[PDB]
Design a protein around this ligand. Structure first.
Ligand SMILES: CNc1ncc2cc(-c3ccc(-c4cccc(C)n4)cc3Cl)c(=O)n(CCCCN)c2n1
Length: 266
């Protein structure tokens, strides 16, 4: 992480694009290349207790090089502010693309396939995302789908073994994938109406959520395969990329540009 070069000279900061983990995030220009970047600025004096978490997500992002994980460009320290620079993705999150209306099973299967690819990359490298959800899946202007905002080493997306603070593995990402499939179909995860502390004991207590609604059988089975209480019974991502729901419904990522265009008129 660079400490000598001034990030205020190296980047043109523009408008906020969201308050994320610990700090505000900005669209910004890279003065060296005029490429657009995302710039997270975290005040470190104003958030000391979590610095190790910031440090952890920075290191694990730096070890990835995949078309499915958002690129990490480095970090800077000016006075007490840490600047975190990432590739900028102009289509928004999958969550933003849910506002216009409801997704068809083509767009759902397509987003899920690309998530499965990044999940497959991360797990092959013995890495765990730990915070899979529609708000952490970002799309480029051209509909490429990438993962962002890795989770620390709201509970609605948590696998039960994760809540029962029992050390876990990659199969926790498959559970969260399942919840994200529901989120993609219905707009919001199971139990979303309820107080988080109620959810904290419902997830280990209750039977797994199922996808209710007029949705295709292969998609419902997809959710059911992901949402098994016992982790070792969930499919791998590699296995899920061969799942009938994906194979019949998932088209080329380019087709998602229509979905982004709707959200930019709206
Ligand atoms: C709208 N497009 C877009 N394109 C790219 C980005 C990149 C980031 C980003 C994510 C994590 C870290 C990060 C890395 C290490 C440690 C920590 C604490 N944080 C930094 C950044 Cl710069 C971002 O927040 N947003 C906003 C939407 C976030 C939705 N969850 C983006 N939005």
């Amino acid at each position: 992480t660079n400490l000598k070069a001034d990030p205020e000279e190296l980047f043109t900061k523009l408008e906020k694009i969201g308050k994320g983990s610990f700090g505000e995030v900005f669209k910004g220009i890279d003065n060296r290349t005029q490429k657009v970047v995302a710039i997270k600025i975290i005040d470190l004096e104003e958030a000391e207790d979590e610095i190790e978490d910031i440090q952890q997500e920075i290191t694990v992002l730096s070890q990835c090089d995949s078309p499915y994980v958002t690129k990490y460009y480095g970090s800077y320290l000016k006075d007490t502010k840490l600047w975190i620079i990432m590739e900028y993705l102009g289509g928004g999150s999958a969550l933003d693309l849910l506002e216009p209306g409801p997704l068809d099973e083509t767009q759902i299967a397509t987003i899920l396939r690309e998530i499965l690819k990044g999940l497959d990359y991360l797990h092959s490298e013995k890495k765990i995302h730990r915070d899979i959800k529609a708000a952490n899946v970002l799309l480029s202007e051209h509909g490429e789908v990438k993962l962002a905002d890795f989770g620390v080493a709201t509970p609605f997306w948590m696998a039960p073994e994760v809540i029962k603070q029992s050390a876990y593995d990659s199969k926790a990402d498959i559970w969260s994938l399942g919840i994200t499939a529901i989120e993609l179909a219905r707009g919001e995860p199971p139990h979303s109406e309820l107080h988080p502390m109620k959810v904290l004991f419902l997830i280990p207590k209750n039977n797994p959520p199922t996808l209710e609604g007029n949705y295709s059988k292969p998609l419902k089975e997809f959710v059911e395969a992901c949402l098994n209480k016992e982790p070792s019974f969930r499919p791998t991502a590699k296995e899920l990329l061969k799942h009938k729901f994906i194979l019949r419904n998932a088209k080329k990522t380019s087709y998602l540009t229509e979905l982004i265009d709707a959200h930019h008129h709206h």
